[PDB]
Design a protein around this ligand. Structure first.
Ligand code: FAD
Ligand code: NAD
Ligand code: UJM
Ligand code: MG
Length: 1217
């Protein structure tokens, strides 16, 4: 067997001194980056004055020829509102999808103008967010398609064919001549002659990036190759400076362009770039490598190095490379490139830009919990960085060819004067973007201006292809901080535009301070708690240190023992094997006898007073100390999780982060809530699943402990070692051994603990079928006070994602691959059923299957592994039996081929199964098996019914740009965690409180504010837990009670209406570019089992105040107590003689003495389907205690996470500069 982690993440090449200086700056604090840049960018007073004078002259010329835009003139002529202008351009876009010009004009004249555009023309408004930027300058992430439809009807009925004609002509010009230089490379070359005669040059961009499949990458390759021929033929020997060149993106040329797949990149991507470069060499044209995301920078340097040292490319100086001045590594990258140019003798063309992905870099660093950003956070810092790096490049013009890409007249003027009076073509150049920079550079190019050349970056492509690049440009043009936006702002003076960023930064009190309004990832939650920290698996220093820590973790002799209050106990011992390779022994577990499990509960009960007496603040301090210990131990914990549970490094990082976040969140919630009157339940049994073997394990135990309960921790039999280490950490943090006992073993140990007389509460996460067995055990039992033993049972899912024809296929496929196959589908949240609108299903399926075949399955101690094993041979057999049954029914089955190395472990290949109906699924299949169904748009409401009809309700995803569809689907779906335009596996503690309904859970949600209150006898009021809304049926019921003379019950009903938090609607703090919402809804239909009239009235008031309907036990004989109900109340009331026929219920309220409660609890447990959260009270308790039935457990929590950056950028951060 290969030694564990012996090949985890070896670098492409040994890191030179220059390469290590780059990596060292990756996330350097901003206050350290700026001082050396300020020093390097300093120019003399005489030059600063001359540059300000040049910049003013350029800006005065720009403002003096600035004319109104074509769209603005169109809006003016026809008095359009903003929505009308957007709707008009969407219509024009759709009309231009009709090729035959005469056919289009016939449709306009005889159909569109005459009225119902709906009857003749995929939503018309799929790209309205883009047109919104064009019309209004603002980015909206989703489209209000009902507003746009109304606006289009209004404008057509008001203005007729003439406005439609003007819109079509405007859109045809912008999409054919402004957003691109041409539709094809031949068209773009024909249009370039005019400005080349004026002294400009060109670099053509065949719009293309982020290949998803091998076929995508092949298509982009032959596009680049065909463009090089056309450009080279046109260049006709003009050479690399006067003649045109090409720009490429490495992400276009391989579907797995990432550091994790570096070996594939060097083996498969590099030869393709070399082949393109050889053709560019033969024509003697430039070939530029564009810069992309920050985690691709250093990888791209390995390709640049090999290409510049390759003798087959010698004699050609056209290789070019972009460096992004908004990045903290920029000057060190330039040092590396300048040295590479010296070593190779290649005069590398270096394009200095600021950078195009700023919003996304802020979001990514926050999501990943990294130390700092890889980009600056103040715009002026990027400006100083640019000028500092320009000074470095201008000192090296013998060795490199600097290309200064900017539309900022202040930046340009500073460099023009920095470069001085000696110039020749080939020394350096400026660059600009087509349709953006020509007004500025027509004041620069030419003997009559500044006599410096400019190369125009010219996008080339069809209307369809122009997508992502266009929104990046329009974001750029619209950002409050952008020069091209400020030049048009009449409130911004020329003196403000020519302000010298170098001197402004120098004069600030704290030079280089982070932006005040952008939180470091550690500070996402402010004073509430410290965010967990992750690890950057693109950082070579991190990979090197992690490799050592992982190897060291694999040499440790991990054990798990029955850790009773009195010390470790003896038992049956066996080895724990790596699921990816059974030859790899990870450790040993000693399992707990049923006798010792019962003994542990008795020890827990004897120790309960001593732990309850530890004040809540000190219990929370133990949790916070445990979190610090797990954070410090993360690399070792990663290694154990990788080998014991079959997790990849990325997934193990997320797992340890979640454990840290649980500890800190429950600690803070404790400090916000728990006081002397919130008494503990007593010994709590925590039974946890194998698949999140540290995070869910820790979360349940931490919550029970901090609420003052001693815990019996029973980890899954598959994953005892990481559980034992978590208990060791909690004990080191100060949790006494009597308060936290570890009982390894199988379900027999869990059952023995559940059944023990002193067990006062059970926290279960696992399969629905096991939860039902525990529900049956507990229905036999009552507390010493005669009440049900509280059970939190968080169970399985049958999770769907709905995708309509407005979604972006590339986004969908990435989120589907992650949601369905991450962790080999062994997430309770994993995507099980993908629902594709019929019109786009074939294209998305083709793309999905292509992405599937790029996944690497194997033992997870290699960074290049995407999908690990399933946990056991029994799990594998159960999953494969499902796949074969489906294959036997003739369903299409797509499967990855598995390498021979997988035979030593238990692997199932990622699988796509195309189904005909959702009813083709019976139970959760906990493996890498995605089911695909198709639907017609008009059947969307029925499809949501079908998703709800499974009885599950855990996670749910929707990909759409259309507000009407978002409103429709999210109001009708019944699931606990919703996700819009993102993956569906998010469970960030305190951000997406996690947990579902129906067959998926009882609640309350883990990682949410109602959780701790379930673990004490009297629940506290959670932070922010209130609602000003009163249920109207409750109000009608209270009036009916008063009319019947039941004055005390009517008062209790009004009080319940006020106390209810139904209607709570909050936004939770989290990362930028996401909205995370938390809401309280009705649970559904509550089963009422009353004994007395007053008890019935109290039960009904509690259920109605929380928005529920009820089914009342007809055997109570209390029908005559509810005569003459208002129709509003009657609609919510039914009577049930056969409870099993009238479900599923969403909870129950029971009145009676102890043996009546026990009898009813058994009858409720026998009902088919979901576990019911039952609350019971005696008649006397209802009389004495207004909170006899707690309203916390009669509402349902819903979490919704919306990716607001999905349209291609972040509107909120556009105002942050
Ligand atoms: C010809 C050409 C080629 C280009 N090629 C690439 C490329 O391959 N890869 C790439 O990533 N970019 C590239 N760019 C740059 C990018 O597309 C933008 O055009 C450029 O960043 C805008 O800078 P500016 O000097 O025109 O305008 P300015 O208004 O002076 O500067 C705007 C820039 O400031 C930065 N910024 C904004 N807010 C903040 C903030 N709060 N904190 C820190 N920085 C901030 C951003 O980089 C933003 O784009 C290219 C640009 C041109 C003209
Ligand atoms: N809703 C959530 O938040 C969530 C999270 C993770 C996993 N899950 C669900 O958990 C399942 C996968 O985890 P698993 O395979 O470890 O679940 P499982 O039901 O097989 O076992 C979970 C735990 O119950 C114990 N157990 C088994 N039989 C028992 C019995 N008769 N009495 C008492 N305890 C018994 C097991 O030993 C284990 O500790 C999946 O169905 C998944 O959907 C849900
Ligand atoms: O948005 C983009 O594509 C960047 C700007 C020009 C090339 S890289
Ligand atoms: Mg099991």
């Amino acid at each position: 067997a290969p030694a564990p982690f012996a090949d985890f993440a070896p670098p492409v090449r040994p890191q030179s001194t220059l390469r290590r200086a780059i990596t060292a700056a990756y996330r350097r604090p901003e206050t350290e980056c700026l001082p050396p840049l300020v020093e390097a960018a300093t120019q003399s007073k005489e030059i600063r004055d001359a540059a300000a004078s040049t910049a003013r002259k350029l800006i005065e010329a720009l403002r003096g020829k600035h004319s109104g835009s074509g769209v603005e003139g169109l809006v003016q002529e026809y008095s359009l509102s903003s929505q009308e202008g957007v709707a008009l351009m969407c219509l024009a876009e759709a009309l231009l999808r009709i090729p035959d010009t005469a056919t289009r004009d016939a449709l306009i004249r005889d159909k569109i103008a005459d009225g119902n555009w709906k009857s003749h023309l995929r939503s018309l408004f799929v790209n309205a967010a883009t047109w919104g930027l064009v019309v209004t300058g603002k980015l909206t992430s989703t489209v209000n398609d009902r507003s746009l439809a109304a606006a289009l009807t209004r404008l057509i009925s008001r203005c007729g064919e003439p406005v439609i004609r003007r819109g079509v002509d405007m859109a045809m010009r912008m999409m054919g001549e402004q957003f691109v230089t041409g539709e094809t490379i031949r068209e773009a070359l024909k249009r370039s002659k005019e400005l080349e005669e004026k002294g400009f040059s060109y670099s053509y961009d065949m719009l293309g990036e982020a290949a998803t499949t091998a076929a995508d990458a092949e298509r982009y390759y032959r596009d680049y190759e065909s463009a090089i021929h056309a450009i080279g033929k046109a260049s006709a020997g003009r050479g690399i400076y006067e003649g045109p060149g090409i720009s490429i993106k490495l992400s276009a040329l391989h579907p797995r362009y990432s550091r994790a797949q570096a070996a594939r990149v060097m083996g498969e991507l590099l030869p393709r770039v070399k082949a393109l470069a050889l053709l560019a060499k033969n024509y003697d044209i430039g070939l530029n490598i564009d810069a992309e995301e920050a985690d691709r920078l250093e990888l791209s340097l390995d390709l640049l190095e090999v290409l510049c040292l390759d003798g087959d490319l010698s004699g050609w100086n056209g290789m070019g490379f972009v460096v992004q001045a908004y990045g903290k590594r920029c000057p060190f990258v330039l040092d590396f490139i300048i040295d590479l140019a010296r070593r190779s003798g290649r005069r590398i063309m270096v394009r200095l830009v600021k950078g195009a992905y700023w919003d996304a870099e802020i979001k990514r660093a926050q999501l990943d919990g990294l130390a700092d950003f890889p980009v600056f956070t103040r715009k002026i810092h990027t400006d100083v960085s640019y000028i500092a790096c320009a000074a470095k490049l201008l000192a090296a013009t013998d060795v490199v060819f600097p290309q200064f890409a900017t539309h900022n007249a202040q930046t340009l003027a500073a460099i023009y004067h920095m470069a001085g009076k000696d110039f020749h073509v080939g020394k350096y150049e400026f660059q600009c973007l087509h349709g953006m920079g020509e007004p500025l550079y027509e004041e620069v190019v030419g003997r009559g201006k500044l006599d410096r050349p400019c190369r125009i970056y010219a996008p080339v492509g069809t209307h369809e292809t122009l997508l992502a690049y266009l929104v990046r440009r329009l974001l750029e043009n619209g950002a409050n901080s952008s020069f091209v936006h400020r030049i048009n702002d009449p409130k911004v003076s020329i003196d403000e535009l020519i302000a010298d960023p170098v001197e402004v930064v120098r004069a600030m009190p704290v030079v280089g301070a982070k932006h005040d309004r952008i939180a470091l990832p550690a500070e996402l939650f402010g004073d509430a708690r410290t965010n967990s920290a992750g690890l950057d698996l693109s950082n070579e220093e991190t990979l090197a240190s992690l490799t050592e820590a992982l190897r060291e973790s694999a040499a440790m002799k991990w054990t798990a023992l029955p850790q009773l209050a009195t010390g470790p106990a003896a038992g049956e011992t066996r080895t724990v094997l790596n699921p990816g390779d059974h030859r790899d022994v990870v450790g040993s577990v000693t399992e707990t006898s049923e006798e010792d499990a019962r003994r542990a509960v008795r020890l827990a009960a004897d120790a309960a007073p001593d732990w309850a007496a530890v004040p809540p603040s000190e219990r929370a301090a133990c949790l916070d100390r445990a979190a610090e210990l797990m954070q410090a131990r993360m690399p070792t914990l990663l290694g154990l999780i990788i080998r014991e549970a079959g997790k990849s490094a990325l997934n193990a990082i997320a797992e340890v982060r979640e454990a840290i976040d649980f500890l800190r969140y429950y600690a803070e919630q404790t400090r916000r809530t728990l006081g002397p009157g919130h008494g503990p339940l007593g010994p709590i049994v925590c039974i946890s699943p194998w698949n999140f073997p540290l995070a869910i394990f820790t979360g349940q135990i931490a919550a029970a402990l901090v609420a003052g309960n001693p815990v019996l921790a029973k980890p899954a039999e598959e994953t005892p070692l990481i559980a034992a280490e978590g208990v060791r950490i909690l004990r080191e943090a100060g949790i006494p051994a009597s308060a936290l006992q570890l009982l390894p073993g199988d379900g027999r140990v869990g059952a023995a603990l559940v059944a023990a007389a002193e067990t006062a509460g059970v926290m279960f996460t696992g399969s629905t079928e096991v939860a039902r067995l525990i529900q049956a055990q507990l229905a036999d039992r009552l507390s010493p006070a005669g009440r049900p033993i509280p059970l939190i049972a968080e169970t399985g899912g049958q999770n769907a994602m709905i995708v309509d024809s407005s979604a972006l296929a590339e986004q969908v496929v990435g989120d589907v691959i992650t949601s369905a196959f991450d962790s080999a589908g062994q997430r309770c949240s994993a995507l099980r059923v993908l629902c594709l609108q019929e019109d786009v299903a074939d294209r998305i399926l083709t793309m999905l299957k292509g992405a599937l075949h790029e996944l690497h399955i194997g033992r997870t101690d290699r960074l290049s592994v995407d999908v690990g094993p399933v946990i056991t041979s029994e799990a594998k057999d159960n999953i494969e039996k499902h796949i074969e049954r489906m294959r036997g029914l003739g369903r299409k089955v797509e499967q990855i081929g598995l390498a021979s190395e997988t035979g030593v472990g238990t692997f199932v290949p990622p699988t796509i199964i195309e189904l005909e109906k959702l009813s083709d699924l019976q139970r959760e299949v906990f493996g890498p098996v995605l089911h695909v169904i198709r639907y017609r748009r008009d059947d969307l409401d029925r499809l949501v019914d079908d998703v709800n009809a499974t009885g599950y309700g855990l996670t749910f995803g929707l990909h759409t740009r259309l507000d009407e569809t978002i409103a429709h689907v999210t109001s009708r779906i019944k699931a606990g965690n919703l996700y819009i335009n993102r993956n569906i596996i998010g469970a960030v503690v305190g951000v997406q409180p996690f947990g579902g309904r129906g067959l998926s859970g009882t609640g309350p949600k883990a990682g949410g504010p109602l959780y701790l209150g379930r673990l004490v006898t009297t629940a506290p009021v959670p932070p922010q837990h209130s609602s000003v809304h009163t249920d109207p049926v409750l109000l009608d019921f209270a009036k009916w009670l008063d009319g019947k003379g039941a004055r005390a019950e009517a008062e209790a009903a009004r009080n319940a209406g006020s106390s209810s938090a139904l209607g709570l609607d909050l936004e939770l703090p989290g990362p930028v570019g996401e909205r995370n919402l938390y809401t309280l809804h009705a649970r559904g239909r509550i089963l009422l089992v009353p004994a007395t009239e007053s008890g019935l009235y109290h039960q009904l008031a509690a259920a109605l105040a929380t928005g529920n309907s009820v089914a009342i036990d007809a055997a109570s004989g209390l029908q005559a107590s509810l005569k003459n109900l208002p129709q509003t109340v009657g609609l919510r009331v039914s009577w049930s003689k056969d409870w099993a026929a009238d479900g599923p219920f969403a909870g129950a309220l029971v009145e009676g003495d102890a043996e009546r409660i026990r009898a009813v609890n058994k009858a409720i447990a026998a009902l088919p389907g979901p576990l019911l959260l039952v609350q019971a009270a005696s008649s006397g308790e209802i009389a004495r205690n207004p909170d006899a039935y707690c309203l916390n457990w009669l509402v349902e929590e819903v979490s919704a996470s919306i990716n607001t950056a999905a349209a291609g950028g972040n509107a909120s951060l556009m105002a942050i500069g």
